[PDB]
Enzyme design. Structure first.
Site, PDB file in Angstrom:
ATOM      1  N   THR D  50       0.818  -1.210   0.000  1.00 14.96           N
ATOM      2  CA  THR D  50       0.000   0.000   0.000  1.00 14.96           C
ATOM      3  C   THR D  50       0.852   1.260   0.000  1.00 14.96           C
ATOM      4  O   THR D  50       0.380   2.326  -0.421  1.00 14.96           O
ATOM      5  CB  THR D  50      -0.915  -0.024   1.228  1.00 14.96           C
ATOM      6  OG1 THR D  50      -1.429  -1.351   1.403  1.00 14.96           O
ATOM      7  CG2 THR D  50      -2.074   0.938   1.080  1.00 14.96           C
ATOM      8  N   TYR D 138       5.410 -12.189   4.906  1.00  6.87           N
ATOM      9  CA  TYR D 138       4.184 -11.639   4.329  1.00  6.87           C
ATOM     10  C   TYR D 138       3.742 -12.577   3.203  1.00  6.87           C
ATOM     11  O   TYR D 138       4.335 -12.586   2.122  1.00  6.87           O
ATOM     12  CB  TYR D 138       4.457 -10.197   3.890  1.00  6.87           C
ATOM     13  CG  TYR D 138       3.373  -9.424   3.178  1.00  6.87           C
ATOM     14  CD1 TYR D 138       2.040  -9.833   3.142  1.00  6.87           C
ATOM     15  CD2 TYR D 138       3.723  -8.259   2.499  1.00  6.87           C
ATOM     16  CE1 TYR D 138       1.081  -9.069   2.432  1.00  6.87           C
ATOM     17  CE2 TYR D 138       2.791  -7.514   1.809  1.00  6.87           C
ATOM     18  CZ  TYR D 138       1.487  -7.925   1.774  1.00  6.87           C
ATOM     19  OH  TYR D 138       0.604  -7.147   1.065  1.00  6.87           O
ATOM     20  N   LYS D 166       2.323 -11.925   8.361  1.00 13.38           N
ATOM     21  CA  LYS D 166       1.205 -11.122   7.871  1.00 13.38           C
ATOM     22  C   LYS D 166       0.505 -11.967   6.813  1.00 13.38           C
ATOM     23  O   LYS D 166       1.099 -12.275   5.773  1.00 13.38           O
ATOM     24  CB  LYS D 166       1.670  -9.787   7.287  1.00 13.38           C
ATOM     25  CG  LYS D 166       0.513  -8.974   6.687  1.00 13.38           C
ATOM     26  CD  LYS D 166       1.047  -7.720   5.990  1.00 13.38           C
ATOM     27  CE  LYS D 166      -0.065  -6.941   5.262  1.00 13.38           C
ATOM     28  NZ  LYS D 166       0.555  -5.866   4.426  1.00 13.38           N
ATOM     29  N   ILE D 206      -2.541  -5.704  10.176  1.00  8.48           N
ATOM     30  CA  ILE D 206      -1.746  -4.787   9.363  1.00  8.48           C
ATOM     31  C   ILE D 206      -2.674  -4.376   8.229  1.00  8.48           C
ATOM     32  O   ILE D 206      -2.826  -5.088   7.225  1.00  8.48           O
ATOM     33  CB  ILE D 206      -0.436  -5.411   8.867  1.00  8.48           C
ATOM     34  CG1 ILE D 206       0.463  -5.736  10.076  1.00  8.48           C
ATOM     35  CG2 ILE D 206       0.280  -4.436   7.899  1.00  8.48           C
ATOM     36  CD1 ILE D 206       1.694  -6.603   9.759  1.00  8.48           C
TER      37      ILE D 206
END
Ligand code: MG
Ligand code: MG
Ligand code: MG
Ligand code: MG
Ligand code: MG
Ligand code: MG
Ligand code: MG
Ligand code: MG
Ligand code: MG
Lengths: 295, 295, 295, 295
Positions: D50, D138, D166, D206
């Site tokens: 992001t 992640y 994540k 997150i």
């Protein structure tokens, strides 16, 4: 309409026991129904996927429904699987199951032929128009090859007789919103996602592993309902090996082999489903011992 | 075994015509069979997916098969769809189709219930053992929710009655190797891949768009077989709008709406399949005009 | 614009050789480039996926391009991989490759970040505006996580510098229509679908297994071009084991291990890619023997 | 190791603000960081997906990290995104981020190039070895095109610096078992699944939609932690329109357009990402009003 009271909170999608010659065994069906309710189930689905609806006849489905209603219908809810990929057939089955006294209907997305969403809608509406029973949609695109899209589920919620969804699609976010917007009740139709579904507002489980672990799944529902999430998580981990064995074997093979290991012979599946091999039984027994459902 | 002579090279997976009241229309079925053979088909599959096998009865399937054999059986090969997700049912239907005089069988992968590969092998072997007819496996995981894995196809190839595969799985590389290693004949079961399948060695097509464009698909096969790939490619582009319409509508809706547009009314689909809407008819008509099969 | 002459018909997406200390090995790059052209390639793609574009620097890409242009640029077409998930970076790289004398550009769909189609379209047109070189789109949703949708490809086709597509999406039906409608040239970017793509009108191959079997792939193209589809099919089966090995290993591992087996050491991959294990080398050598590219 | 204290419980994967000419805007980054922490975040991830990690330079990432650490590092945990598809680059970035004073690292699965699992393991181990910082894997196969398989996660769990995951893979069942077996901390990396992940034992979020609704997500975490699942479920429904808008727009477009609507201009995305159209802004504003984060 009190969905938890009228349809239940812990249901097993019960196997259909067969004798050694492959014929329907209703005596064992009644014994198994009593066993599952005694272990904690407050409802049963007869002739679901796990009940081998593909390979039983209409007459066998009705005989089984009658035997299970006689066995446990006064103290548990008995939901009849009545949907196929043929709308006229589904209507006949729904009417026959209502005539026997089923407490509700479970109606799967028409499989194989991949109707468009407006054909799914016309199908489910036609089945809901056939009897006065409460009806659950059963959304399982991994088997039926098409989903009930959210706009279609929402349209069907406007039918007065369509009261909920057995979900095996796992779109938890969409189901949460549908529940909030329409008041449809959701049941987890995938044991691996029982606890996430409860978090999102599901009423309960229509379970496969409850054949082997109904008592623990009942404890999980109670712990979650009382806010004791740590205990619900611990129980969920305890039964996780059963979900793992389900992924290897499928619900039909797992349930018939697992019940046998627990001392309840329900026969073998009908082709094209197959009985567990000796090696598969050994690996399943290991998971059941890990889950504390086998000595 | 001369597959091209015994089963054909251009087959239509024929619709099952219904009357205005939804009942079976064998008079129109005979008329349509004659039309499709006169336009270039040298075989027909009755009660395939496109023939709405999910929503017709055993008795309707046999009555249709008899009507089509009587109409075209002396000049075209008539292949009966005989497979469901129920092995005992599939055996009964295969035997009944053989007794009527079917020239071959098309047997789909059991859908919805997701049997393991060894269950598929037992199922297909049981059906292949049931009659003396040549048999095509029909591999369509996008509908049935499980593939016939290549090891399973290779195991089944040694059955004397199993002679080929109708492929709607699109693994052209695997199919090419299976053709080379086993001598199984492949038929394209997805009109979009007709030309790629010919390149890889397929014997022909079991087609949906042949309802509307059999003459051009016959020219495509003739052009490709003579070595004129460039013309085969041009014909494939010419009929591509029909493939696009089939993607939008599905084969059942496409075939019944398109035949009505061409002046051969075959009724409407049975629920959960649905007739094309007026907007869909307009868009389909445009594709048919683009493909030079209308107006 | 003559795509076959300006970009080629048999290209290898060439590995980037690394020395023992891990640095770029331009002497081996020149040797390999000469080998692949001598074996039948009429073009090469440098710093494609198989060239480990993720793990080389801009300076290494330019040094490699310079070395390969010097080695074979007078007798083969040298196409530079210039696309990343960063439009400004892609423009910089495209301009640098044009300044070095690349004959064309290969520009992959931006990976990982999943831009919308209008962002893809803005990206590709911005790169296409950056130089006067001809440019191929590289459609590989299995790596980039988004496709170039057919409407987007069709819109990009009107850019004068966008002349074709390297396809690893395998929508043969859509690509056939796009070639017919727009005149974009297609290259097979998946060796398993080389023969299907030729049938649908592809200009040729941007190949991984050409590292090992360029001579046979040239023979395949020649046989297909002359209408000898039987021979093209036979060659395609002959090299199928290399496609199977590529499915197990991926192009980078396969190409570097396979060249080493053939006596052309090009070093090892950079992390996170890895060199073949001893057992992978054993299995790869077996496939290479089966494909007649290793004794 | 106290993961909640050392990394946080509510983190935003913060956008990277750009000026009108597209350059890095560190003053606005500091302002946004202070805003998000004041609203309830106790940590921030800089240069996550992001944060437009694909289109920023190393120098920009370090300047941004420095600015955010100065802004909130004394009262919130600042995690640096440090992973790409290039192991050597990832190590350089991880070392530079540790040198700046980052409190932890977020390392995505190498995207696009599809390394095998042993390559993933070697990659993550090399990055974890490069600094003393705690590190989160992640797992986002929907972007990177390969998952971190459970065996690989379990192998990496033994690394002293690898402390959690994540998750954007949504295998809640596997994640639950991994948490039970390894003690890795899980963070929801998909806002749609925030509440299911908490039920399975996740430490926190997150988040993308925390750009707009951090206060409500903090309330959700607090309600769930206190056993008030009904309130957590109601808050999850309240912010569900933001998840829907995220699905339509992607996190980068959503976050920059939504912050502007709230009065916090953070500029526009860098190509290939795009700024919202007026129609998209209207639909987003409706979702934000529904979620009570816009007047
Ligand atoms: Mg039946
Ligand atoms: Mg029937
Ligand atoms: Mg026999
Ligand atoms: Mg045979
Ligand atoms: Mg780089
Ligand atoms: Mg220009
Ligand atoms: Mg152009
Ligand atoms: Mg960069
Ligand atoms: Mg650790």
């Amino acid at each position: 309409f009190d969905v938890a009271a009228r349809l239940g909170t812990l249901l097993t999608a019960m196997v259909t026991p067969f004798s050694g010659d492959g014929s329907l065994d209703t005596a064992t069906a009644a014994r198994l129904a009593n066993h599952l309710v005694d272990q904690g189930c407050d409802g049963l689905v007869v002739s679901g996927t796990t009940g081998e609806s593909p390979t039983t006849t209409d007459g066998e489905k009705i005989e089984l429904l009658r035997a299970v209603l006689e066995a446990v219908g006064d103290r548990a809810r008995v939901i009849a699987g009545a949907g196929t990929y043929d709308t006229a057939h589904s209507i006949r089955l729904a009417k026959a199951c209502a005539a026997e006294g089923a407490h509700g209907l479970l109606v799967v997305t028409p499989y194989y032929s991949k109707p468009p969403q407006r054909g799914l809608q016309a199908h489910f509406t036609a089945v809901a128009d056939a009897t006065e029973l409460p009806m659950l949609l059963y959304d399982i695109p991994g088997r039926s090859a098409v989903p009930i899209e959210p706009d279609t589920i929402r349209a069907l919620a406007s039918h007065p007789n369509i009261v909920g969804v057995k979900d095996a699609k796992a779109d938890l976010h969409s189901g949460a919103q549908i529940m909030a917007d329409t008041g449809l009740a959701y049941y987890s139709g995938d044991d691996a996602l029982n606890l996430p579904w409860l978090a999102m507002g599901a009423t309960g489980f229509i379970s496969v592993i409850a054949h082997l672990a109904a008592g623990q799944l009942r404890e999980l529902l109670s712990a979650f309902g009382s806010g004791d999430i740590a205990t619900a998580r611990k129980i969920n981990i305890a039964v996780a090996p059963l979900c793992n064995a389900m992924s290897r074997l499928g619900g039909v093979t797992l349930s018939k082999a697992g019940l046998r290991l627990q001392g309840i012979d329900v026969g073998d599946p009908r082709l094209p489903q197959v009985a567990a091999t000796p090696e598969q039984i050994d690996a399943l027994a290991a998971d059941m011992r890990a889950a504390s459902v086998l000595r």
